[PDB]
């Protein structure tokens, strides 16, 4: 998933 920003994952 290149479109996923891990800095904007609300599950973290």
């Amino acid at each position, epitope marked *: *998933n*290149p479109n*996923a*920003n*891990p800095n904007a*994952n609300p599950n973290a």
Partner: antibody
Amino acid sequence: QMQLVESGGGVVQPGRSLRLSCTASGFTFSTYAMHWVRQSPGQGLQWVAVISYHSTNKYYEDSVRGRFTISRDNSKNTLYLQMNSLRAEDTAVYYCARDGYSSSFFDFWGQGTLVTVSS
Amino acid sequence: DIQMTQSPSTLSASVGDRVAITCRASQSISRWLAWYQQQPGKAPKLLMSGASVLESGVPSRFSGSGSGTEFTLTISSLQPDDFATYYCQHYNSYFVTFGQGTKVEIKR
């Protein structure tokens, strides 16, 4: 083209140390957790360790926790595995793998580098 | 902690066959189950995740099923490239484990 180029393997003597490298190209290395997975000759697969995208989280399997250290340099698109106190049980092909879905499974693998622990 | 047992360890079949590989988990893992294919001298390759979701480029003759503790990888019509070794893997936690592998060889 997506590729994961591994290096640093070879013959190493028992009790000694060794660092593996895995260099990424063709995708954004810095947004993915990265894993090391190994396979001994004639055997199956075994997960070794993972590192989060910004290195905050590092996890290891039982047999290597305390001897192996995983790290990365996102500015170089490089993943490392520092192996210490190497044992005959560590002989294997070592793969680096991308966690494309951030879910602890592996959608893209490098072709591996062999590590032989022998005197 | 979680043991993944595949069965059979080896499987003999011919081109055009429907074949099924089983993977049992020693503990409930919902649908967090991935299948990999490995050709000789090649790194493994992801076939499915979530038990049944195919990766782009994996022929649709592959299909996975199951939930909880038992899972099945099915090949509707075996093709020459499909003879290889197949591994299952759970991702119920960070500390993943693989099955021992199932080798699909040619019957004669």
